[PDB]
Amino acid sequence: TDPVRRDPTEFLRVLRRMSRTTSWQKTMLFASKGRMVGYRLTREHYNTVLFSQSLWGRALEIVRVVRAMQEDKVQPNGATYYYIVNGMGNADHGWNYDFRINRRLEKIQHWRVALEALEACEANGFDSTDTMHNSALITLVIPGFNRWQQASLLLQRMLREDRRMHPTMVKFYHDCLVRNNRPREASSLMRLAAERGVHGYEDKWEADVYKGRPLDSEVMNESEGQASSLAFASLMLRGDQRPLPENLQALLEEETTRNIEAERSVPVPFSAGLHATEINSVFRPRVYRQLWYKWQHIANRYRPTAALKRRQLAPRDSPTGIPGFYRI
Amino acid sequence: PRRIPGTTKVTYTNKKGRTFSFSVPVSELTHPQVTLESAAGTWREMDTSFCELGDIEDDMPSPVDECLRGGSSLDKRLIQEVRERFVSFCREYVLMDTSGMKSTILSTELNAGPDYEHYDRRLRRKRHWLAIRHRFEDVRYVIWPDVVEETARGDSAQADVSLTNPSLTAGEMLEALLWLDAASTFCVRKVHPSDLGDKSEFLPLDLQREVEVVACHARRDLDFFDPS
Amino acid sequence: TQEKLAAAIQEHVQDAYRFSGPTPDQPRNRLADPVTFEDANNMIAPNAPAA
Amino acid sequence: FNPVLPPSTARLRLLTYPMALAQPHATVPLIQPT
């Protein structure tokens, strides 16, 4: 308990060093035990801890830090909200051979936590950046979650505020829409990406085949407020296709519904009850493979498509640079 | 105007000739923090009462908690939402995939719950069933309100009240009771030294009153059973 | 038990502080802070000047 | 009816004391003359 270390200055310096060098466990343990033993954690300390947790994509740890901060009555700020949203967006997920990577994230409502963080950031008067909105949308549209309605609402408010769409968010939202069978919304998202100029989406532009069709919510509201007549508007016609008398139309529609339900009820072998978007989809934050990225852009700086295999950066009988290397 | 003090920026010259420029906020470490005022006018703290953690003391959050938060159990729509969420919770528990559970006594977990990496395996199902027990004890009288036959006039008044407020029909009440009975029969039986709760908790439930209420509603309706 | 737990947590904090490596010498800390006893003690109450 | 506040706050409160100069409504100086 030397006086050189029993001071807030050295504690903050070591906390910054761990947040910039080591993993999230070091910062969490050091902060919690210092708080227990007598070091007071201010806004700077909490923001450093949350920066580390967001960088490593931890959700439960972020929630615990938020609870401790609220208990200690530390007021958050824009950096705190940004870190919370970024951590919730960087929470690792996916399926690896019918094995779910992060099933605890299902019960940890990180999408709701991020949405509340964004709402608080906007309400308190801080400047919410586009990365926060994109991370909030990703939290809704990750493969384990199906919240495309709230994702659409968030994207509409983003477009009204003229925000920027990230390629990763666009890809995840498109995958979610295709998985949830929303071709109209997927085409709209693709057209928006092509118009804005998102990287990789400058050529995925397609004609709108639902140009004259009303919304599903519109037809539902019309039915709630003749449903037999509204069925003709609900069903799409090709122009050269003409309606049939309603008595036979009802039978035909019932036949089509029964056939579609029978087709979709059939189990898909070897799919593990997972969609094609969820098959072989494991996402982890870039902190996991930062060393791989750095050494790839050194050993194969001019061969980006080449695989970063060992013996390119180390001889035989000698250690390679990256300890974990591929995965763990 | 409550101006926030600035960090102390120091430049140090290493003997090797390097320079280190770092800003240590020494002022805002002992001085009290400068709180800000929300743009909307009042500060809104983020809510974290719905998250599920490895907190052994806290009960596992359920969707029934959101409906119980309001407390307006008189509303028929609220009652229907409560019933739907409770049935969903019980059905999720019954159909839970119990592949890698492995619930056996571990010595090292005497003064704490299961390990962080063992939460889903040897803690999740027990917490889920304890939450089911708590939610049932909270909302049993809402899902299956107590019946009172009284005399003939009392029965007439009870029937009039039931027809005025048929919040839940006999079919859905029976479905809820069936899922509750299935969960009770497939409850968690093995207790651990780490279990801070009472040992009598891990026992099947007694649903005599609920059976009586659902029977009352079944005889209230004209034909509960069909040849199908 | 409270005091023993506090001592154990302090020992854990020392083990964590071991991560920082060897501690720097006095002049770094001495030049880190230009604070004086006046600013140190004005936080609680302002003492009258000596007479 | 309303779910209780999380009793896990005891763990956060464990081995913690209210700082005199870190209270939400504490000023400098801590004690003011009458």
Partner: peptide
């Protein structure tokens, strides 16, 4: 000597516990 340095007084007054009044 670093312990004797005046910043220790700042640390002590910052970490001074609040005393509750008797009820």
């Amino acid at each position: 000597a670093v312990a004797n340095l005046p910043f220790a007084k700042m640390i002590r007054v910052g970490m001074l516990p609040e005393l509750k009044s008797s009820k």
